[PDB]
Amino acid sequence: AKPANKLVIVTEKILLKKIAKIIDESGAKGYTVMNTGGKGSDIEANIKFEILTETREMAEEIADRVAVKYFNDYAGIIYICSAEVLYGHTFCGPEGCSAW
Amino acid sequence: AKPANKLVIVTEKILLKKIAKIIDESGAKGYTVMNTGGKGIEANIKFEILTETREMAEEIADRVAVKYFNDYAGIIYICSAEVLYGHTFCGPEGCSAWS
Amino acid sequence: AKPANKLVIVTEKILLKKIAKIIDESGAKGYTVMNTGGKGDIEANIKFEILTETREMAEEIADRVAVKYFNDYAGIIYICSAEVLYGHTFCGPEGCSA
Numbered sequence A: 001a002k003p004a005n006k007l008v009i010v011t012e013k014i015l016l017k018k019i020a021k022i023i024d025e026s027g028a029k030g031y032t033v034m035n036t037g038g039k040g041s042d043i044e045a046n047i048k049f050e051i052l053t054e055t056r057e058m059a060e061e062i063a064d065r066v067a068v069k070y071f072n073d074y075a076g077i078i079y080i081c082s083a084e085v086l087y088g089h090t091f092c093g094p095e096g097c098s099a100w
Numbered sequence B: 001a002k003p004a005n006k007l008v009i010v011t012e013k014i015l016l017k018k019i020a021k022i023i024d025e026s027g028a029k030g031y032t033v034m035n036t037g038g039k040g041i042e043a044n045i046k047f048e049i050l051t052e053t054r055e056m057a058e059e060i061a062d063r064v065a066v067k068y069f070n071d072y073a074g075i076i077y078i079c080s081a082e083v084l085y086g087h088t089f090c091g092p093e094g095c096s097a098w099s
Numbered sequence C: 001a002k003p004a005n006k007l008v009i010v011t012e013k014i015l016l017k018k019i020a021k022i023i024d025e026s027g028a029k030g031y032t033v034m035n036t037g038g039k040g041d042i043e044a045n046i047k048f049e050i051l052t053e054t055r056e057m058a059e060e061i062a063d064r065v066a067v068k069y070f071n072d073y074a075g076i077i078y079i080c081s082a083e084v085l086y087g088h089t090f091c092g093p094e095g096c097s098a
């Protein structure tokens, strides 16, 4: 298992591409995005990205970048969970997630 | 980053409003809900509520579980999270990137 | 609260049943699956979340899925610490106690 940070960005759907770009630009290996509702009849549609980042700082870079660009104007929460990636060709490389 | 508990409630879709009410009542600053399938495939919903404290999360969990989980399928679990950003979650205070 | 591993498998939608079977076969008490998009532009995939009582059950599932599918199918499997607060099936009549 390879430590990861699960960066979660829940924010407005309309930022999807904007945030995907940020995620792509961060060098995060990918991301998972889903449609969600959230409150912060009063549920609003939003999207949740989950970006497993190799490092915390990458996650924060993404968070910071998203937040600074968008979170004044757009609803969003970014949080981060410890994860370990057990498998993820892209995330762990040909190396595998048990790089001995 | 502000420590949080990601309270996850996966339960029957029909409880959405009912649980949202509980969440709203808990003083949780918001929640994220999504449609999911599950076996425990039935359509259900997953709430994710980031709570400032563990006890809030448990209050919600306890409240939901007591009010619904003896009659409705549902799992509640809780993950450590840190909120990096979340106006509503961290307040005007911010999520205090330095602790 | 009962410690759990939230095994998350994000992979191609078409593996849903195949992975569900693996999950079911692992003796995981259940799983949550959702439709997701992902990049690794967005492709539709599924995220399973399996709360497993033990890490090794999660890894068993992960290993089984990854071995059986991840050479041919896109997917990431990762695992989070979780605690189950409630989950009849997950914690048994015993309750989530701890």
Ligand SMILES: Nc1ncnc2c1ncn2[C@@H]1O[C@H](COP(=O)(O)OP(=O)(O)OP(=O)(O)O)[C@@H](O)[C@H]1O
Pocket: B010, B011, B036, B037, B038, B039, B040, B041, B042, B044, B072, B073, B074, B075, C028, C029, C030, C031, C032, C033, C049, C050, C051, C052, C087, C088, C089, C090
């Ligand atoms: N071990 C688990 N891992 C991940 N998700 C779970 C787990 N157990 C339950 N869930 C989620 O919570 C839902 C409710 O599960 P529960 O065991 O309480 O009821 P169930 O009647 O078995 O549900 P189902 O209708 O899915 O069979 C499940 O469908 C699933 O979405």
Ligand SMILES: Nc1ncnc2c1ncn2[C@@H]1O[C@H](COP(=O)(O)OP(=O)(O)O)[C@@H](O)[C@H]1O
Pocket: A010, A011, A036, A037, A038, A039, A040, A044, A046, A074, A075, A076, A077, B028, B029, B030, B031, B032, B033, B048, B049, B050, B051, B086, B087, B088, B089
């Ligand atoms: N405490 C929380 N737990 C989980 N998700 C949250 C929480 N607070 C906010 N969210 C998610 O982030 C989204 C935006 O939240 P926020 O910026 O507070 O603005 P708003 O009040 O305009 O929805 C919500 O719709 C929800 O999906």
Ligand SMILES: Nc1ncnc2c1ncn2[C@@H]1O[C@H](COP(=O)(O)OP(=O)(O)O)[C@@H](O)[C@H]1O
Pocket: A028, A029, A030, A031, A032, A033, A050, A051, A052, A053, A088, A089, A090, A091, C010, C011, C036, C037, C038, C039, C040, C043, C045, C073, C074, C075, C076
């Ligand atoms: N760093 C990551 N963070 C979050 N999810 C990821 C990450 N990398 C991959 N995924 C998820 O796994 C899926 C497939 O992974 P991958 O093996 O990279 O295939 P692909 O590159 O063909 O999409 C992605 O579409 C995405 O949902």
